[PDB]
Design an enzyme around this catalytic site. Structure first.
Site, PDB file in Angstrom:
ATOM      1  N   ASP A 115      -2.734 -31.965  -1.442  1.00  7.33           N
ATOM      2  CA  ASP A 115      -1.690 -32.641  -2.225  1.00  7.33           C
ATOM      3  C   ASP A 115      -2.111 -33.186  -3.608  1.00  7.33           C
ATOM      4  O   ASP A 115      -1.373 -33.035  -4.586  1.00  7.33           O
ATOM      5  CB  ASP A 115      -0.991 -33.731  -1.409  1.00  7.33           C
ATOM      6  CG  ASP A 115       0.342 -34.129  -2.024  1.00  7.33           C
ATOM      7  OD1 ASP A 115       1.254 -33.273  -2.088  1.00  7.33           O
ATOM      8  OD2 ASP A 115       0.441 -35.241  -2.563  1.00  7.33           O
ATOM      9  N   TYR A 126       6.926 -13.059   1.443  1.00  2.00           N
ATOM     10  CA  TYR A 126       6.022 -13.401   2.513  1.00  2.00           C
ATOM     11  C   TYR A 126       6.608 -14.431   3.486  1.00  2.00           C
ATOM     12  O   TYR A 126       6.618 -14.199   4.700  1.00  2.00           O
ATOM     13  CB  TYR A 126       4.698 -13.892   1.926  1.00  2.00           C
ATOM     14  CG  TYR A 126       3.695 -14.205   2.989  1.00  2.00           C
ATOM     15  CD1 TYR A 126       3.059 -13.175   3.703  1.00  2.00           C
ATOM     16  CD2 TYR A 126       3.385 -15.546   3.314  1.00  2.00           C
ATOM     17  CE1 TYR A 126       2.159 -13.476   4.719  1.00  2.00           C
ATOM     18  CE2 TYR A 126       2.474 -15.848   4.313  1.00  2.00           C
ATOM     19  CZ  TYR A 126       1.886 -14.812   5.019  1.00  2.00           C
ATOM     20  OH  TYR A 126       1.004 -15.114   6.003  1.00  2.00           O
ATOM     21  N   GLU A 144      14.767 -13.811   0.777  1.00  2.60           N
ATOM     22  CA  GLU A 144      14.975 -12.369   0.747  1.00  2.60           C
ATOM     23  C   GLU A 144      15.155 -11.778   2.148  1.00  2.60           C
ATOM     24  O   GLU A 144      14.202 -11.258   2.663  1.00  2.60           O
ATOM     25  CB  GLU A 144      13.770 -11.718   0.023  1.00  2.60           C
ATOM     26  CG  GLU A 144      13.642 -12.119  -1.451  1.00  2.60           C
ATOM     27  CD  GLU A 144      12.357 -11.652  -2.129  1.00  2.60           C
ATOM     28  OE1 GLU A 144      11.774 -10.644  -1.683  1.00  2.60           O
ATOM     29  OE2 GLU A 144      11.939 -12.295  -3.131  1.00  2.60           O
ATOM     30  N   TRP A 155       8.530 -11.413 -13.219  1.00  2.00           N
ATOM     31  CA  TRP A 155       7.438 -11.678 -12.267  1.00  2.00           C
ATOM     32  C   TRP A 155       6.250 -10.859 -12.749  1.00  2.00           C
ATOM     33  O   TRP A 155       6.364  -9.639 -12.840  1.00  2.00           O
ATOM     34  CB  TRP A 155       7.846 -11.211 -10.842  1.00  2.00           C
ATOM     35  CG  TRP A 155       6.761 -11.287  -9.866  1.00  2.00           C
ATOM     36  CD1 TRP A 155       5.801 -10.331  -9.643  1.00  2.00           C
ATOM     37  CD2 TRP A 155       6.403 -12.415  -9.030  1.00  2.00           C
ATOM     38  NE1 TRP A 155       4.912 -10.783  -8.695  1.00  2.00           N
ATOM     39  CE2 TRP A 155       5.230 -12.051  -8.318  1.00  2.00           C
ATOM     40  CE3 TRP A 155       6.951 -13.675  -8.816  1.00  2.00           C
ATOM     41  CZ2 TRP A 155       4.592 -12.911  -7.397  1.00  2.00           C
ATOM     42  CZ3 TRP A 155       6.317 -14.554  -7.896  1.00  2.00           C
ATOM     43  CH2 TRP A 155       5.154 -14.163  -7.205  1.00  2.00           C
ATOM     44  N   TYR A 214      13.842  -4.811 -10.190  1.00  2.00           N
ATOM     45  CA  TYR A 214      12.565  -4.167 -10.219  1.00  2.00           C
ATOM     46  C   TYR A 214      12.196  -3.916  -8.748  1.00  2.00           C
ATOM     47  O   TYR A 214      12.978  -4.231  -7.875  1.00  2.00           O
ATOM     48  CB  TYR A 214      11.551  -5.065 -10.929  1.00  2.00           C
ATOM     49  CG  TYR A 214      11.517  -6.531 -10.527  1.00  2.00           C
ATOM     50  CD1 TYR A 214      10.908  -6.936  -9.357  1.00  2.00           C
ATOM     51  CD2 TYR A 214      11.930  -7.521 -11.404  1.00  2.00           C
ATOM     52  CE1 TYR A 214      10.841  -8.279  -9.015  1.00  2.00           C
ATOM     53  CE2 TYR A 214      11.871  -8.868 -11.085  1.00  2.00           C
ATOM     54  CZ  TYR A 214      11.316  -9.250  -9.900  1.00  2.00           C
ATOM     55  OH  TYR A 214      11.220 -10.573  -9.569  1.00  2.00           O
TER      56      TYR A 214
HETATM   57  C1  LIG Z   1       2.943  -4.368   7.761  1.00  2.00           C
HETATM   58  C2  LIG Z   1       3.848  -3.987   6.942  1.00  2.00           C
HETATM   59  C3  LIG Z   1       4.885  -3.558   5.971  1.00  2.00           C
HETATM   60  O1  LIG Z   1       5.949  -2.855   6.641  1.00  2.00           O
HETATM   61  C4  LIG Z   1       6.695  -1.910   5.851  1.00  2.00           C
HETATM   62  C5  LIG Z   1       8.037  -2.534   5.397  1.00  2.00           C
HETATM   63  C6  LIG Z   1       8.316  -3.832   6.166  1.00  2.00           C
HETATM   64  C7  LIG Z   1       8.112  -2.750   3.862  1.00  2.00           C
HETATM   65  O2  LIG Z   1       7.064  -3.697   3.548  1.00  2.00           O
HETATM   66  C8  LIG Z   1       6.393  -3.610   2.245  1.00  2.00           C
HETATM   67  O3  LIG Z   1       6.749  -2.792   1.411  1.00  2.00           O
HETATM   68  N1  LIG Z   1       5.483  -4.542   1.960  1.00  2.00           N
HETATM   69  C9  LIG Z   1       5.186  -4.903   0.586  1.00  2.00           C
HETATM   70  C10 LIG Z   1       6.364  -5.711   0.043  1.00  2.00           C
HETATM   71  C11 LIG Z   1       6.219  -6.019  -1.440  1.00  2.00           C
HETATM   72  C12 LIG Z   1       6.828  -7.383  -1.761  1.00  2.00           C
HETATM   73  C13 LIG Z   1       7.892  -7.324  -2.865  1.00  2.00           C
HETATM   74  C14 LIG Z   1       9.321  -7.171  -2.338  1.00  2.00           C
HETATM   75  C15 LIG Z   1      10.360  -7.748  -3.297  1.00  2.00           C
HETATM   76  N2  LIG Z   1      10.251  -9.193  -3.504  1.00  2.00           N
HETATM   77  C16 LIG Z   1       9.895  -9.685  -4.682  1.00  2.00           C
HETATM   78  N3  LIG Z   1       9.378  -8.867  -5.521  1.00  2.00           N
HETATM   79  N4  LIG Z   1      10.215 -10.962  -4.947  1.00  2.00           N
HETATM   80  C17 LIG Z   1      10.203 -11.539  -6.174  1.00  2.00           C
HETATM   81  O4  LIG Z   1       9.912 -10.985  -7.253  1.00  2.00           O
HETATM   82  N5  LIG Z   1      10.605 -12.821  -6.157  1.00  2.00           N
HETATM   83  C18 LIG Z   1      10.700 -13.636  -7.343  1.00  2.00           C
HETATM   84  C19 LIG Z   1       9.520  -3.194   3.339  1.00  2.00           C
HETATM   85  C20 LIG Z   1       9.729  -3.207   1.812  1.00  2.00           C
HETATM   86  C21 LIG Z   1      10.637  -2.361   3.907  1.00  2.00           C
HETATM   87  O5  LIG Z   1      11.149  -1.464   3.259  1.00  2.00           O
HETATM   88  O6  LIG Z   1      11.131  -2.708   5.234  1.00  2.00           O
HETATM   89  C22 LIG Z   1      12.270  -2.002   5.750  1.00  2.00           C
HETATM   90  C23 LIG Z   1      13.565  -2.798   5.523  1.00  2.00           C
HETATM   91  C24 LIG Z   1      14.456  -2.164   4.467  1.00  2.00           C
HETATM   92  C25 LIG Z   1      11.965  -1.689   7.226  1.00  2.00           C
HETATM   93  C26 LIG Z   1      11.419  -2.908   7.990  1.00  2.00           C
HETATM   94  O7  LIG Z   1      13.177  -1.304   7.878  1.00  2.00           O
HETATM   95  C27 LIG Z   1      10.960  -0.513   7.208  1.00  2.00           C
HETATM   96  O8  LIG Z   1      11.535   0.659   6.591  1.00  2.00           O
HETATM   97  C28 LIG Z   1      10.620   1.737   6.351  1.00  2.00           C
HETATM   98  C29 LIG Z   1      10.400   1.927   4.853  1.00  2.00           C
HETATM   99  C30 LIG Z   1      11.275   3.029   6.816  1.00  2.00           C
HETATM  100  O9  LIG Z   1       9.337   1.488   6.994  1.00  2.00           O
HETATM  101  C31 LIG Z   1       9.300   0.960   8.351  1.00  2.00           C
HETATM  102  C32 LIG Z   1      10.336  -0.152   8.563  1.00  2.00           C
HETATM  103  C33 LIG Z   1      11.343   0.249   9.636  1.00  2.00           C
HETATM  104  C34 LIG Z   1       7.885   0.475   8.748  1.00  2.00           C
HETATM  105  C35 LIG Z   1       7.760   0.279  10.269  1.00  2.00           C
HETATM  106  C36 LIG Z   1       7.465  -0.812   8.018  1.00  2.00           C
HETATM  107  C37 LIG Z   1       6.830  -0.585   6.643  1.00  2.00           C
HETATM  108  C38 LIG Z   1       5.462   0.084   6.824  1.00  2.00           C
HETATM  109  O10 LIG Z   1       7.649   0.320   5.895  1.00  2.00           O
END
Ligand SMILES: C#CCO[C@@H]1[C@@H](C)[C@H](OC(=O)NCCCCCCCNC(=N)NC(=O)NC)[C@@H](C)C(=O)O[C@H](CC)[C@@](C)(O)[C@@H]2OC(C)(C)O[C@H]([C@@H]2C)[C@H](C)C[C@@]1(C)O
Length: 498
Positions: free
Chosen positions: A67, A97, A143, A402, A213
């Site tokens: 803090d 996150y 988000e 960002w 973006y």
């Molecule tokens: C352990 C893990 C990550 O999991 C990803 C999966 C969870 C992806 O995770 C990542 O890309 N991780 C890195 C994220 C970057 C942060 C910035 C985002 C924006 N936020 C900001 N920039 N914010 C900001 O600027 N704020 C000011 C995620 C983007 C995603 O597309 O999830 C979709 C939901 C629409 C899922 C969960 O359905 C996902 O879809 C697909 C693409 C088909 O993949 C599967 C699953 C089913 C898979 C099982 C899960 C992954 C592998 O795709």
């Protein structure tokens, strides 16, 4: 000529707060002191990120946070206000996150907004954190709330607004009133979760900062630009999910608002907002990335655009192959998929094998590594000219980005945005905005000005006939129609009178 907002995220992780220093960039790469007076003047807002919501359903620092160190970092930011009496230091609650559907604090967001009492407690915690640490307003970066949770989220923003307004009165801050923003979805798939209630969401806000973006990434099958201003017909298109939102519109209304498939661009997100009644352009702020997204395994022919690729999507990045050649920050951060604009300048300047290419439809740059099969999608001072011109022409509120640490050391990206908006000697009146694909949707909030002959009773109108009536220009959906426009379903309101 109200001043455009220029909103910069300042992100610092807990470990860096707890070891805060301004003289060792291997512990804190981007200390508050890197924000010079000149940068402070170019900014209107700094969004300190990220606070969270805890399991008491209150706004809270990560509990591992020291803090005294936290207060000290925040005091260094609020001291910047000495160089710029317009400047606000907001704080942000959320981020991917903490707040994504599988994020570590997700259930706290859902529960914080779920009931009247929970909202009161949450809202009070936000204002209290704001006053305790000396912030100038509240940004929410959840988000994203899902359609069921949207009414609570709305109610939560309304309640925060009222408390912010009380606070502004108590402190006599009418010259710089406490503010409330959110980071909004910048693409139709997440936007569709709350789109039907957009006017309600935006009403309590000073701005909605569109995350225009990350519109491409390793989760897609095909490389693409992460922040194309306008569309490229050679590029991929997407299903328009907004046409399934719970709007109560007719087939023709939905079709005219929501072409599908469509190009996933900045212009699309912005227009999708403007199409809604009650969403004013001045409240819409365009997000831009200060970083590139890199893909590997791409083939040739079109500069690595629109190619299959082999970039892992897992988080954290799942091995130690840091294949983004020349990217030293990627090694430090263990992820070759993201490179700061700062790092990208260096990769382009060194002997690392990249070419800078320019897509004249999207008005965005990209790096291509012919030998290794790499593609990087990013923004620079050139792409920002078009985006700034678009911000002016569409009467948007401003620009968000960002994040500040990703600018180059001289802060050229920030300087450029500040120049395109405020420099007396900068002229973009002849800047050519290209023939990229515009989003053509029209909805109740963005009817074009039109003229047409006045409606005449007793006349038989064929399909497609246009008339003017009671302020609007109307179009028959079929023929032959004789009803007064607006009195039954045969007429489509397509425009507003001249
Ligand atoms: C352990 C893990 C990550 O999991 C990803 C999966 C969870 C992806 O995770 C990542 O890309 N991780 C890195 C994220 C970057 C942060 C910035 C985002 C924006 N936020 C900001 N920039 N914010 C900001 O600027 N704020 C000011 C995620 C983007 C995603 O597309 O999830 C979709 C939901 C629409 C899922 C969960 O359905 C996902 O879809 C697909 C693409 C088909 O993949 C599967 C699953 C089913 C898979 C099982 C899960 C992954 C592998 O795709």
């Amino acid at each position: 000529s109200t001043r455009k907002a220029v909103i910069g995220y300042y992100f610092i992780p807990t470990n860096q707060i707890n070891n805060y220093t301004e003289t060792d960039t291997s512990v804190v790469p981007f200390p508050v002191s890197n924000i010079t007076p000149a940068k402070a003047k170019q900014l209107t807002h700094i969004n300190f990120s990220f606070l969270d919501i805890n399991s008491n359903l209150e706004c809270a620092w990560d509990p591992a946070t020291n803090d005294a160190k936290a207060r000290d970092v925040v005091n260094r930011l609020t001291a910047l206000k000495a160089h710029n009496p317009s400047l606000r230091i907001m704080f942000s609650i959320g981020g991917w996150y903490y707040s994504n559907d599988l994020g570590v604090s997700h259930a706290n967001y859902v529960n914080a907004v779920k009931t009247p009492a929970a909202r009161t407690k949450f809202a009070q915690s936000c204002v209290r954190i704001m006053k305790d640490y000396g912030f100038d307003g509240v940004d929410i970066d959840w988000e994203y709330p899902q359609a069921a949770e949207v009414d609570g989220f709305i109610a939560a923003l309304q309640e925060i607004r009222t408390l912010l307004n009380q606070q502004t009165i108590a402190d006599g801050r009418q010259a710089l009133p406490y503010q409330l923003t959110i980071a909004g979805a910048g693409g139709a798939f997440f936007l569709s979760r709350y789109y039907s209630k957009l006017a309600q969401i935006v009403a309590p806000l000073d701005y909605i900062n569109l995350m225009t973006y990350d519109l491409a990434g390793p989760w897609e099958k095909i490389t693409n630009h992460q922040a194309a201003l306008f569309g490229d017909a050679a590029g991929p298109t997407f299903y328009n999910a907004l046409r399934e939102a719970n709007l109560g519109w007719s087939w023709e209304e939905l079709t005219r608002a929501f072409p599908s498939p469509f190009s996933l661009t900045v212009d699309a997100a912005v227009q999708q907002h403007l199409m809604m009644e009650g969403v004013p352009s001045a409240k819409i702020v365009m997000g831009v990335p200060f970083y590139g997204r890199a893909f590997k395994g791409v083939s040739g022919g079109n500069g690595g655009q629109y190619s299959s690729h082999s970039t892992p999507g897992e988080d954290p990045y799942p091995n130690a192959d840091y294949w983004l050649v020349g990217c030293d920050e990627c090694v430090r951060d263990k992820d070759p998929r993201i490179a700061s604009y700062r790092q990208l300048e260096q990769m382009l300047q060194g002997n690392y094998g990249y070419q800078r290419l320019w897509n004249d439809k999207t008005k965005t740059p990209y790096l291509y590594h012919a030998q290794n099969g790499l593609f990087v999608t990013y923004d620079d001072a050139e792409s920002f000219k078009y985006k700034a011109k678009y911000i002016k022409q569409q009467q948007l509120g401003g620009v968000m980005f960002w994040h500040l640490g990703q600018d180059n050391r001289n802060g050229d990206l920030l300087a450029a945005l500040d120049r395109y908006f405020n420099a007396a000697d900068y002229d973009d009146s002849q800047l050519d905005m290209g023939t990229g694909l515009r989003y053509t949707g029209v909805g109740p909030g963005n009817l074009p000005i039109m003229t047409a002959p006045a409606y005449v009773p007793g006349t038989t109108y064929a399909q497609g006939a246009l008339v003017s009536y009671q302020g609007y220009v109307w179009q028959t959906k079929w023929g032959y129609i004789t009803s007064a426009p607006g009195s039954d379903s045969a007429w489509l309101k397509v425009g507003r009178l001249a």
